[PDB]
Amino acid sequence: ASSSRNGRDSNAQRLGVKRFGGQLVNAGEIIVRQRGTHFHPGDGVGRGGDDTLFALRDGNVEFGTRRGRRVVNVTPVE
Amino acid sequence: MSKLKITQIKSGIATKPNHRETLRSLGLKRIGDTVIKEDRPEFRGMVRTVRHLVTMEE
Amino acid sequence: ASTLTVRKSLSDRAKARARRQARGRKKIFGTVERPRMVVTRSSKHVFVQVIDDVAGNTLVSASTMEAELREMSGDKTAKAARVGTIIGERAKAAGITKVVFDKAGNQYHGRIAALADAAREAGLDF
Amino acid sequence: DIIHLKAEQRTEFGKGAARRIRRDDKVPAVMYGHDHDPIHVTLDGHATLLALRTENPLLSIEIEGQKPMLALPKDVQRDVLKGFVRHVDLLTVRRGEKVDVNVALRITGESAPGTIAMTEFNEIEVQADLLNIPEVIEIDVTGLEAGTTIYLGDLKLPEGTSLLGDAEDVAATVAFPET
Amino acid sequence: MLIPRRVKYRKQHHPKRTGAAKGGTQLAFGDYGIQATEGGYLTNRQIEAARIAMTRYIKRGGKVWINVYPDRPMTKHPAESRMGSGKGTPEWWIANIKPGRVLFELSGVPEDVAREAMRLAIHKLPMKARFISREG
RNA sequence: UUUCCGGUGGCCAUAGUGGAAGGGAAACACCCGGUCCCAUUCCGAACCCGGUCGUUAAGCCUUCCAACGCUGAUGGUACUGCACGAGGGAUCGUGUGGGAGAGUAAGACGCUGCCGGAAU
RNA sequence: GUCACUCAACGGAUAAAAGGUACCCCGGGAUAACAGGCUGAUCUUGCCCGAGCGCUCAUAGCGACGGCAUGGUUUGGCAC
RNA sequence: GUCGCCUCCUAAAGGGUAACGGAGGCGCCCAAAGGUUCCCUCAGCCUGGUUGGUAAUCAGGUGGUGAGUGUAAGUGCACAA
RNA sequence: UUCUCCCCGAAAUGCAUUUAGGUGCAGCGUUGCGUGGUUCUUGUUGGAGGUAGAGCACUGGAUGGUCUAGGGGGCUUAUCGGCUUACCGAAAUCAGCCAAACUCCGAAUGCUGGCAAGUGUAGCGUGGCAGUGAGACGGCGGGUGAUAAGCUUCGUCGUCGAGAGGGAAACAGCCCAGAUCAUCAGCUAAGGCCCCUAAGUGGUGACUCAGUGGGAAAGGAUGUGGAGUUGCGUAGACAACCAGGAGGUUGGCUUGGAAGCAGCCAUCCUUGAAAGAGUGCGUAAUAGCUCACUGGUCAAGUGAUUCCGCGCCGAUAAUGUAGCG
Ligand SMILES: CCC[C@@H]1C[C@@H](C(=O)N[C@@H]([C@H]2O[C@H](SC)[C@H](O)[C@@H](O)[C@H]2O)[C@H](C)Cl)N(C)C1
Ligand SMILES: [Mg+2]
Ligand SMILES: [Mg+2]
Ligand SMILES: [Mg+2]
Ligand SMILES: [Mg+2]
Ligand SMILES: [Mg+2]
Ligand SMILES: [Mg+2]
Ligand SMILES: [Mg+2]
Ligand SMILES: [Mg+2]
Ligand SMILES: [Mg+2]
Ligand SMILES: [Mg+2]
Ligand SMILES: [Mg+2]
Ligand SMILES: [Mg+2]
Ligand SMILES: [Mg+2]
Ligand SMILES: [Mg+2]
Ligand SMILES: [Mg+2]
Ligand SMILES: [Mg+2]
Ligand SMILES: [Mg+2]
Ligand SMILES: [Mg+2]
Ligand SMILES: [Mg+2]
Ligand SMILES: [Mg+2]
Ligand SMILES: [Mg+2]
Ligand SMILES: [Mg+2]
Ligand SMILES: [Mg+2]
Ligand SMILES: [Mg+2]
Ligand SMILES: [Mg+2]
Ligand SMILES: [Mg+2]
Ligand SMILES: [Mg+2]
Ligand SMILES: [Mg+2]
Ligand SMILES: [Mg+2]
Ligand SMILES: [Mg+2]
Ligand SMILES: [Mg+2]
Ligand SMILES: [Mg+2]
Ligand SMILES: [Mg+2]
Ligand SMILES: [Mg+2]
Ligand SMILES: [Mg+2]
Ligand SMILES: [Mg+2]
């Protein structure tokens, strides 16, 4: 007969948004795993080596736009 | 606030688990059991979630 | 008025300086702790503003257009040095302590450098 | 000619309300214009069908409470398989004002038996008047053959109907038979 | 035979057979048309048979348009073989037809001969179809 | 206070692209030089410095144009959560909620904050 | 701290290992051979349209290109 | 035929999701192709010009991402990564 | 693998495995202690998305039109150059399209936070004891397979497993409904009410005449009932019955015969109230019967076309009616 010349898939990477808008986070909490900057780091958000976006401070996550970039901010909690 | 009167007419067997928890949240236990709720949007939402299982009056 | 795109039909020097300014602003941002010191350098004058970029409002400013500096006899670099001294004095008057310097698309050289060094002499932590 | 259509107010919106209306042998319609808010009405199904048999007809919408209103059916959602009209857009019009419309095309010429003529468009853009809406625009191609082409810049247009669309595209084409 | 010059993927999932026609429900080329009232898969051989029927009836007058192209490859399992061992190779090329899709257009021919030619062509298609015109 | 204008942000085309006309008081800008700090993978073109002569020609700014592009309802339709129904079958329909894309009418020749200059 | 594994059958039985059994021997219908069951590609038997052949004439006899089905006696698919 | 890892689709708009399903890659490379700082904008098209032609190199206009990215693909990057 | 009852009550999944009918860990059960609304439902208020649908902005696929750089074939004749460009024709543009691995767009749901109400007594931590790790069918969304399988492989809900009762003729998985025991009380669900078989041979109004109901396709058809659009019509419509039912003209390429019937064609003219270089029968070939039309007694409706409801044919296995139980 014949055989299948496909069959290989990589393991699941479980990317995506981990903390959504208005969610209270600690400093250092990961907000989104991503490849590239689909989201950019905003105010109080840092970007990791693998483009992970993490909270630089305590507060609430918000998603927005800064200039032309789609950003994630962590607004300090009042 | 017209004090909704909700009575169960069909069973919870073979319905979605959402519907069964909605029936439990309304205080309904058996077919034919009746509860009086305040006319508030959450109870109306519960009623319209399981409208195929209950009847409502004022 | 700050559109993210560089407006076309701008002159070549204007387009190049706009690109340089936008690239400089990528890492420079004025907060209350460290406001941004922007020096606009034209062919005649230097206009300095210290800006809290969070609120988008200028804290203090200085220029060669002020009354006590039109008559002052000096060179363009000397006038820029006097402007740097004045802006440092005004920053100390308003309680600024430290600034982050923004050359606004120009090279840190000559008039801008003299302004920055004079502001440093005045007492600015940068 | 002006076709009078009886309408009555529509207050239930949605797919279910439209389904009930169409099950009651009626047609939903929205009438919008320039100096008023959109008015939602429902019309008789068969009367609307007869009125919309023609294209670009001047309709007088008659609502019991309100005054009559002049309109042109700008969009007609018909059933694709059956012919029933499903929804009518009614653009209200003024008596002393121009209207842009789409007038129809046909070929009534008779070329040589070998060569055949074709029409390359359905309806064409025309600025005209209310009480004078041309039925069609004819292009007669008799004895014109080979690679002759007809563009929209030179057509025997009726009076009061100027030309709006780009006059740099063809509407009719005569050519040899299919080989 | 209508076969595409090339396709990006030769092994593809079956086209959806759900829904009314997405586009091409109104005559755009000819003066009369064949409109599909049922969905299905229209192979290139059926398209060719219908085209031959229309073209042979109408003879020398007018033009015929095929509004649907069979650019969807359908694979075939190796014959007499069990299941598995990968997907088969393409065997048929189909167009995905939905109710209300104008399949063929016809022009430059009067209405009765057009009707007869399109009746002949419709008797070749695997779905139900009807003769349509531009309101006369 | 106001008007006009020079910088510096925010929204990131309702802002742009294109066309027509007009303006420079301070400012801006081209412009004139290259001695000096400094520079070109060659060139004072550019970067940098000394001037502000000349000029509003371009940048810039004001106004007009819906033209290209952009924004864009209402209604309907597709789709769909839940509950059902129909067909021999691909598949289809209804009740009750939600509801586009396209298209149409239409909007639109930018809105706004701070600093400064001139006049008021 | 660092080094030595195509331990690649890549959570890596041993440092170290190929075959025959028709002479064979000691749970599964979780799984193949027969038959039944389902399906019906294939097979089979019909039919629809009618290009054309039949001197002329589609349909006496036929019947391209296409389309729709029956049966379940073929080869298969499934593995009940 | 396959066996570990990576990218995409199937996968039903969080994540996850199978088949001997559909496509491809990896078992490296780079002392710079790492760090930092500063500067720059491409491909394509049009026109003019010795060898020189579609395409080496130069000049003017236009062109916003269609070029590029060490290496598959996807997400990104012209503020340039 | 041996007595009883009381309370609770699964799994047939994930990962790994010399593993695949075994096992470990996790998931799901139970139970002691601890913590208490933290869980769940609904509402409301935010968030990321790229599926359905749609669209053609990109990438591919594609139909026709306009126009064209450039290739083919020929010519006067080629070193050019012109006559062609009636053939092919990249790209550009207009119109209609297609896509799991396309997206200028973009839901419903689902997921995840805040708040509010409701709520079974849910959730969580930590210990003891497990069993399970062969699933099945059905609804919805998919891949494999042929638009296949009571097929296979996923996602989700339900039931069976492990679930009795009522309905489905019988009939694990479908519908209703979850059995603590007794009851010779009542009301209902799904489903039913002529008899088997409890309850209506129920009332009213339509349709069917096929035993359709009580299986099936392409397709065929003056079945039947109803609703529109349109042509002709007491200036007299359609059918029947009485006279002109034919001239030049045996119009042409045929074919010993196409004079009206071999086929293809410009598809007319006339004595004239009237006729087609020709519709059927006949026919070696011509004759002829007779059709569309004109007048007459009569004369009240006739001819298409679209759709809808219920029917007809197509229909077709082997023990015995045997596809309403
Ligand atoms: C292709 C044959 C399929 C199998 C044959 C059959 C079977 O086991 N038959 C037996 C057969 O053996 C003897 S008769 C020789 C027994 O008397 C008889 O009842 C049967 O068991 C032998 C193998 Cl022939 N099985 C039930 C199925
Ligand atoms: Mg890094
Ligand atoms: Mg790294
Ligand atoms: Mg379209
Ligand atoms: Mg819109
Ligand atoms: Mg809407
Ligand atoms: Mg919309
Ligand atoms: Mg392993
Ligand atoms: Mg070992
Ligand atoms: Mg044995
Ligand atoms: Mg078995
Ligand atoms: Mg068998
Ligand atoms: Mg048996
Ligand atoms: Mg199995
Ligand atoms: Mg996902
Ligand atoms: Mg999902
Ligand atoms: Mg799984
Ligand atoms: Mg229990
Ligand atoms: Mg196991
Ligand atoms: Mg265990
Ligand atoms: Mg789709
Ligand atoms: Mg298992
Ligand atoms: Mg399973
Ligand atoms: Mg299932
Ligand atoms: Mg199974
Ligand atoms: Mg059970
Ligand atoms: Mg039971
Ligand atoms: Mg029984
Ligand atoms: Mg119980
Ligand atoms: Mg009773
Ligand atoms: Mg009942
Ligand atoms: Mg009885
Ligand atoms: Mg009776
Ligand atoms: Mg009765
Ligand atoms: Mg029967
Ligand atoms: Mg039938
Ligand atoms: Mg029965």
Q: What does the radius of gyration of chain B's CA atoms come to, in whole angstroms?
A: 10
Q: What is the resolution of this structure in A?
A: 2.5
Q: Which residues of D touch E111 (CB under 8 A)?
A: none
D108 with D79, same domain: the answer is no
Contact A5 E86 (CB under 8 A): yes
**Which nucleotide shows the minimum CA-to-C1' distance to residue D29?**
F75
If you ran DSSP here, which 8-state letter would residue C28 be given?
Answer: -
D83 with D104, same domain: the answer is no
Q: Which residues of A touch E78 (CB under 8 A)?
A: 1-2
Contact D116 E63 (CB under 8 A): yes
Number of domains in chain D: 2
Place of tokens 């003529």: D117
D103 with D87, same domain: the answer is no
Cα D136 to middle of ligand 10, angstroms: 93
Contact E85 A6 (CB under 8 A): no
- CB B43, CB B22: distance < 8 Å: no
Cα E87 to middle of ligand 14, angstroms: 21
Contact E62 D81 (CB under 8 A): no
Angstrom distance, E25 CA to I108 C1': 27
Count Cβ atoms within 10 A of the Cβ of residue D30 and give its class: 0-12 exposed, 13-18 middle, 19 or more buried.
Answer: middle
Q: Which two tokens stand for residue B53?
A: 């299982």
CA-to-CA distance for B48 and B54, rounded, in angstroms? Answer: 9
D6 with D75, same domain: the answer is yes
D75 with D46, same domain: the answer is yes
Contact E78 A6 (CB under 8 A): no
Q: Give chain I positions with protein CB within 7 A.
A: 40-44, 46-49, 53-56, 60-67, 86-87, 94-102, 110, 112-114, 116-120, 142-149, 151-152, 157-159, 175-178, 189, 218-219, 228-229, 265-266, 307
D134 with D54, same domain: the answer is no
Closest CA to C29 of A40, A72, A54, A66: A66
The technique by which this structure was obtained is cryo-EM
Nearest-Cα residue of chain D relative to residue E130? D81
Interface test with D, best of E26, E63, E127, E128 (most D CBs within 10 A): E63
With a 7 Å cutoff on the CB, does C54 touch strand F? no
Q: Give chain H positions with protein CB within 7 A.
A: 1-10, 14-25, 37-41, 63-64, 74-77, 79-81
D68 with D113, same domain: the answer is no
Count Cβ atoms within 10 A of the Cβ of residue E7 and give its class: 0-12 exposed, 13-18 middle, 19 or more buried.
Answer: middle
Q: Which two tokens stand for residue C46?
A: 């230097």
Q: Give chain G positions with protein CB within 7 A.
A: 41, 48-51, 64-68, 75-78
SS3 E75: strand
Tell me how far CA of residue B40 lies from CA of B4, B34, B52, in angstroms: 9, 17, 20
CB proximity D179 to E under 8 Å: no
- The beta-carbon neighbor of E21 closest among D80, D114, D178 is D80
State CA C114 to chain mean position distance: 12
CA-to-CA distance for D37 and D24, rounded, in angstroms? Answer: 26
Nearest-Cα residue of chain A relative to residue E79? A1
Beta strand pairing status for E64-66 and E101-106? Answer: antiparallel
Place of tokens 């994630």: A72
D8 with D29, same domain: the answer is yes
Cα E37 to middle of ligand 20, angstroms: 58
D68 with D129, same domain: the answer is no
CB proximity A5 to E under 8 Å: yes
D89 with D102, same domain: the answer is no
Interface test with E, best of D77, D178, D179 (most E CBs within 10 A): D178
Q: Which residues of A6-20 are buried (b: 16+ CB within 10 A; e: fewer)?
A: eeeeeeeeeeebbbe
Q: Which two tokens stand for residue D177?
A: 């038979």
Beta strand pairing status for D58-63 and D69-78? Answer: antiparallel
- CB B31, CB B10: distance < 8 Å: yes
- CB C84, CB C119: distance < 8 Å: yes
Contacts of residue E129, defined as CB under 8 A and 6 or more positions apart, other chains included, come to E34, E35, E36, E37, E38, E103, E122
- CB D134, CB D174: distance < 8 Å: no
**What number of other Cβ atoms are within 10 A of residue A73's Cβ?**
19
D126 with D100, same domain: the answer is yes
* Residue D25 lies in domain: 1-93
Contacts of residue C18, defined as CB under 8 A and 6 or more positions apart, other chains included, come to C6, C10, C105
CA-to-CA distance for A16 and A57, rounded, in angstroms? Answer: 21
Nearest-Cα residue of chain E relative to residue A6? E86
Closest CA to D129 of D43, D70, D64: D70
What is chain D's percent helix, strand, coil content, to nearest 5? 10, 45, 45
* Residue B5 lies in domain: 1-58
- CB C100, CB C37: distance < 8 Å: yes
CA-to-CA distance for E46 and E123, rounded, in angstroms? Answer: 10
Contacts of residue A26, defined as CB under 8 A and 6 or more positions apart, other chains included, come to A55, A58
Q: Final residue of a domain: which of D93, D122, D146?
A: D93
Number of domains in chain B: 1
If you ran DSSP here, which 8-state letter would residue C62 be given?
Answer: E
Q: Helix E44-58 vs helix E111-122: angle between axes, to the nearest 10 degrees?
A: 150
Closest CA to C85 of C55, C52, C125, C114: C114
Q: Which residues of E touch D178 (CB under 8 A)?
A: 55, 60, 62-64
D65 with D114, same domain: the answer is no
